[PDB]
Amino acid sequence: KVQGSVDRRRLQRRIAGLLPPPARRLNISRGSEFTRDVRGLVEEHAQASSLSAAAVWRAGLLAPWRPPVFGDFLIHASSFNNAEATGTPLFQFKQSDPFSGVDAVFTPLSLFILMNHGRGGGLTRMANLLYDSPATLADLVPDFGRLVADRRFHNFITPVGPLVENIKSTYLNKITTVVHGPVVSKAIPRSTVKVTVPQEAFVDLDAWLSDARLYVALTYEEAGPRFTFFQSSRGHCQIMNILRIYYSPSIMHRYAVVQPLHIEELTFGAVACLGTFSATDGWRRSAFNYRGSSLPVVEIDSFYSNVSDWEVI
């Protein structure tokens, strides 16, 4: 009966003007359906390349939704457990043997049981409950004690971002991880994705200070190492200083008792940036439950995993 601040027709024609063009079909079924598609193709190239108003019209009409790269790995189905969550940040340990048809990756629970086997709360019992034997992952890695003696464990672990597609097989499980770009679902349709980090290995740097990048942090504690995950919206180049300050109350306090030799053991931990999620969406705590018990878990949506290099603290 009255007039709105917006007419529907003007908004309708504005949306129709700013609409992307349809993707070009090409029927390989019938030749009568093929000649119209190839005529549309040659007319599209003609009106997109001839020097007239049609070229600049179609050039402004184009929008640039690029698909991210994906990492296809083959891991042992016994060295993995498919009961874990989808969006878990995997860590491909570098295998020096070229005579290896498969590779080996690591969920944080697996390297957590590796650090606990090298030497807690509920997550250590959850990791013992998920991966029942640390001996499997212990003899999966060839040189664990030696490479942690020389402290080059960090460049032998390359983070491959979160896990999205994970099939389930008897032998030789295949996993698919997004490495660069936005996390998204590839085989299962491209709707939504999350990143599950264990909350006990994930601490907020800015809450300790009291975009949104995410940092993976190895530390070499003097009885055996540990991973921790750091979220901070601060600088890409001013993350080393604040984390140096954060690990300062521990380093000499447990480093008074140790002294190196045959020189190694000076590098105290190393840190890479897994990538960035948006400052709009925060991280929402949830619960990760195996069939024995449950564990708190942190969900991070809309990630853009851009894995950097490990940087020593």
Partner 1 sequence: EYRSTVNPWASQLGSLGDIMYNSSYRQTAVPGLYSPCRAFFNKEELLRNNRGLYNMVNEYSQRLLEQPCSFLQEAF
Partner 2 sequence: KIHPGVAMTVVRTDEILSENILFSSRASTSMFIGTPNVSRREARVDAVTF
Partner 3 sequence: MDLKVVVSLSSRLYTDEIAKMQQRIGCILPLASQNVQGLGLGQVYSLETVPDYVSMYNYLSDCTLAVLDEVSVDSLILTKIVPGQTYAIKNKYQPFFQWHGTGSLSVMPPVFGREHATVKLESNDVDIVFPMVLPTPIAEEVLQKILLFNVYSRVVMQAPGNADMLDVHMHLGSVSYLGHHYELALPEVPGPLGLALLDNLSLYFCIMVTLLPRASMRLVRGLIRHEHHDLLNLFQEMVPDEIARIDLDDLSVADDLSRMRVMMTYLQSLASLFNLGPRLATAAYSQETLTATCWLR
Residue 219 to residues 146, 244, 251: CA-CA distances in angstroms? 16, 11, 10
Q: Is 275 left (phi over 0), alpha (psi -120 to 50) or beta?
A: left
171 is an interface residue for partner 1 by CB under 8 A: yes
Among partner 1, partner 2, partner 3, none, the one that 170 touches (CB under a kind-dependent 5 to 8 A) is partner 1
* 8 A C-beta contact, residue 127 and residue 108: no
In the complex with partner 1, which residue's Cβ is closer, 48 or 147?
Answer: 147
29 is an interface residue for partner 1 by CB under 8 A: no
Among partner 2, partner 3, partner 1, none, the one that 184 touches (CB under a kind-dependent 5 to 8 A) is partner 2
Q: Say how far residue 85 (Cα) sits from the centre of its chain.
A: 13
Q: How many residues bind partner 2 (CB under 8 A)?
A: 15
In the complex with partner 2, which residue's Cβ is closer, 150 or 211?
Answer: 211
Amino acid 46 reads: A
CB of 21 to partner 2, least distance (A): 12
Residue 244 to residues 197, 268, 277, 313: CA-CA distances in angstroms? 23, 10, 23, 6
* 8 A C-beta contact, residue 73 and residue 173: no
In the complex with partner 1, which residue's Cβ is closer, 76 or 180?
Answer: 76
In the complex with partner 1, which residue's Cβ is closer, 122 or 142?
Answer: 142
Pick from 76, 117, 180, 244: which binds partner 1 (CB under 8 A)? 76
Q: What does the binding site for partner 3 look like in residue numbers (CB under 8 A)? A: 64, 66, 69-72, 92, 94-98, 103, 155, 158-160, 179-180, 211, 234-235, 237-238, 240-241, 244-245, 248-249, 251-253, 255-256, 263-264, 266-267, 279, 306-309, 311-312
Site residues (CB under 8 A) for partner 2, limited to 250-309: none
Which one of the spans 2-10, 130-138, 194-202, 206-214 is the region binding partner 2 (CB under 8 A)?
A: 2-10
Which tokens hold the place of 204?
């907020």
Pick from 14, 45, 125, 146: which binds partner 2 (CB under 8 A)? 14
* 8 A C-beta contact, residue 307 and residue 284: no
Among partner 2, partner 3, partner 1, none, the one that 63 touches (CB under a kind-dependent 5 to 8 A) is partner 2
In the complex with partner 3, which residue's Cβ is closer, 23 or 256?
Answer: 256
CB of 83 to partner 1, least distance (A): 14
Pick from 7, 37, 43, 143: which binds partner 1 (CB under 8 A)? 143
Among partner 2, partner 1, partner 3, none, the one that 14 touches (CB under a kind-dependent 5 to 8 A) is partner 2
Q: Is 66 left (phi over 0), alpha (psi -120 to 50) or beta?
A: beta
In angstroms, rounded to a whole number, what is the distance separating the alpha carbons of residues 311 and 313? 7
- Contact residues for partner 1 (CB under 8 A)? 76-79, 95-99, 101-102, 135-136, 139-140, 142-143, 145-146, 170-172
Residues that bind partner 2 (CB under 8 A): 5-6, 10-11, 14-15, 18, 20, 63, 65, 67, 182, 184, 190-191
